[model samples]
Target chain A: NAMDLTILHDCFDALQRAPTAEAAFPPIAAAAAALGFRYCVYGLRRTLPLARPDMQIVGNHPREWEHRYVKFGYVTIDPIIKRVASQPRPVVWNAFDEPGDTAFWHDAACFGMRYGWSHGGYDRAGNLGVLTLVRDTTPLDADEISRLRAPCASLSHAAHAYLMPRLADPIA
Target chain B: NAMDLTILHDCFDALQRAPTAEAAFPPIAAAAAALGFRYCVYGLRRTLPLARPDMQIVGNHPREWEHRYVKFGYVTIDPIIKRVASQPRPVVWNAFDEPGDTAFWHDAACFGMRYGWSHGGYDRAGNLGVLTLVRDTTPLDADEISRLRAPCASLSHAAHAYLMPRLADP
Candidate 1:
């Protein structure tokens, strides 16, 4: 399908015009879906939360997955989340191999079976929040990466534009 | 070779120490080279006249490639560059097959062949300064990208740490 300039235009507008984080996320999510992607999430990862109450999603992952993740101390085991904290660029799973720890690999394989992935992060104060895309089961190639440019750019712009100033100074 | 902790530490420190753009660039480039990658250049795209006297180069692409890129107005023609300016995060292109126009493709292909095909961009306010890794001889796979995460993150933080405050409106 050809790129939806209308959706793209709407997303671009939302990035600048949305008065609230709630108002901002839908357009960003809609744009990603229109672009043949599976999932789009934009949120902050910080020691202290931001003022955007509507931006939080408690059940973003499956209930079971989230429970297992926390129970197993899997947050520490999650390379994707760790990568976002440590890396600035968008990462594709196929392009970045999982590390060799057995516990890490088991969790990663389980997560992989659930969704295809792409993610990018930005630091705010002392914490990091990531915008992630996880497809149901599709192979994303380089061209898909190119096609995602407009929406992805808009998402990034919106997140930064909204979140940064609202944040308090990082704790020293 | 295992990732070097000291060089990585120096790179991070350099980022914090970079009072000017010139100082922030070299440590990231040197670290990337030490880690077995080919090309690494961090640009401040919004603050233009991109090819400056102090801009460092740490990979294999010829000096002629840099000169030609600036002289021929390739910056204007690069799609990824525009994307980075509008976006806030980093973008990676290990294999780029989107040719919106045939003329662009012809030009990009020769450029890619000369400079092996990897590109990453980091957004800086209105402009996007990119760090492209050209492995003309050695293509990078997943582990390489993974290994690069710490250094890239450190570089981005360092660049922001340096530039954002100076450009701030007090």
Candidate 2:
């Protein structure tokens, strides 16, 4: 039957079937791209005691920046990521709405300008995953954002589902 | 001396100048209702680990039903409230998609049929405050819900701002 509910059900069912490890990346990437989101990254927090957690990035960013981030320990100075670690809600970078150091803003603007990406994230139980949506200043209008919301919600749900089962020993 | 930005600044300046709690309610309520919401009731969670977590009811439902709810502690059994309390993002409830619970379904249907309100919420820690837009089913649409998103975002921010200064113990 050609029902809207059927399509919705099929999409979720397909996601539920994603294999827990690297095998799941293709479907996850496809769903992210389909929703006008170009880059999908997942991170698992690696700090212990859950209070001061850190993450290992595992999706798409320029290899050079990603390597430099880890190499130079930019995670220590990245305020947005630190804020996301404690919040249960999706944190939008635009909502920061405050001044920061020249070096920090300089680095952030360069990364965005290079990748044409702006990031948003979800943190659950101290584990953080950054989803960098590749778009410029006029990034996806409100309607488009709403259209993409459900898939993002599902992607979040799937992250918890996949991680809880395979990585039961908390990464932190 | 008067500029658009200055006027905007004055508007908030006036709010900051308000002398009493009651003085603040009218403007906030008027703004919310002008956007088509029926009524607005602000509440707080009075429980463990998350006390005074703000709540709001913004729409019309039968006064009698609300009385009955408070009388019997139905808020504890409310699945919508419970679900929203646990998450940190905004969610919409489509009446057509809820699980089948004859009595609960019947009660929710009565609200939909009577007040024409559908619910939405954003979680704050262990508590949640929902915003319901009361209107007939046909009058409500996805576009209307989308428009409310920014306002709801503002509402949450305002609630936090109002509460933060008062929070010294916790």
Candidate 3:
């Protein structure tokens, strides 16, 4: 099988068999680590009421950074989310990509979340689930990006499609 | 403002002031038509029930095409949704982008829908709304596409942001 397709092949049955959405992250993240990533974050959001909508996240990043990420409400305020929303494609950003917010990216890098690959996965309802892989070292460039793009996208949709069904309020 | 940004500037106040989400399409479409496109489509989806999920659409395309579109369940099956979903960028296609499906593209062209510019607009919630502008004639090329990309994306986010708030489930 092509390396591209094989990247997420082992994760399918694990995702398929996982009893719950929260249980789904480890196997997927396992795939990330084997590919040399240090951390993988997956986020699923609720869309109902458009107000008071919420999200569920699963990842293996440090608890401290996770707490800081939530307390600071980085999910909504982060430039990457809006950039991903508008751009409509998974992108690879190094050292947090932009200097738009020095402190925010700085905090991220301090946590060893330096290089990253992220994709915005969604359904027709605009319900969004995102998959991001990060590491402190290594280089990602345009040529490498072109090769990694499809498989990463494949992993994203696979994760979203299977996990959406398992999550409590997929479209909430 | 650059013509790119200026294209949507005139419509902002109207959108900012529109009383209903449905009221938002016309001004945006008006801008589209002025740019030589005959049809502009805006669709917002409901993510409440993952199983029975639904969508709302407002566009200037012939009602005939719209009816066929919904009846045939083109929203999910049409290749473009996946293409737009996976690509993550606004794009232009002429007489359809590929021969992947002869029938769907054929039906689209039959409705005088030969050319198109489209984008997938979403929030972190993954709630997706799309904006498309189409016409039966003219040529769309890489050069024109580069120029159109930003403004079209601007229109998509504009339509999605305003329409999302006013729609019943927005």
Q: How do these models rank on lDDT, best leading? A: 3, 1, 2
TM-score to native of every candidate shown: 0.43, 0.47, 0.50
* lDDT of candidate 3 at residue B21, scale 0 to 100: 66
Where model 2 places Cα greater than 4 Å from the true spot, the runs are A1-38, A42-51, A82-130, A135-172, B1-55, B60-64, B83-106, B113-126, B129-170
Docking class of 2: incorrect
Residue range A28-106, candidate 3, lDDT tens digits: 7877776667898877675674865466777888787778878877866776666665554456777656767776687
lDDT of 1 by residue, B65-100 (tens): 666656666666666565554544455553345546
In model 3, what is the error at residue A129, expressed in angstroms? Answer: 12
Chain A TM-score values, per prediction:
0.66, 0.66, 0.84
DockQ, candidate 3, comes to 0.05
Which lDDT value does model 3 have at A133? 86
True contacts kept of each: 0.01, 0.00, 0.04
lDDT for each of the candidates? Answer: 0.48, 0.44, 0.65
Q: Give the candidates in order of TM-score, highest first.
A: 3, 2, 1
For candidate 2, lDDT tens digit of each residue in B1-170?
A: 11211222222334455544355444444444555555544444434444323333322455765655565555656666665445434445545556644455455556553232322222223233343444334455665554344344333333323322122113
- Candidate number with the higher TM-score (2 or 3): 3
Best by TM-score: 3
Q: Compared with the true structure, what per-residue lDDT tens digits does model 3 show for residues B1-170?
A: 13323445556546756777667778788778766689988766655667644777778788888888788777656666666665444556665666676767877888988889877655545566767899888768756554443345445555655665465444
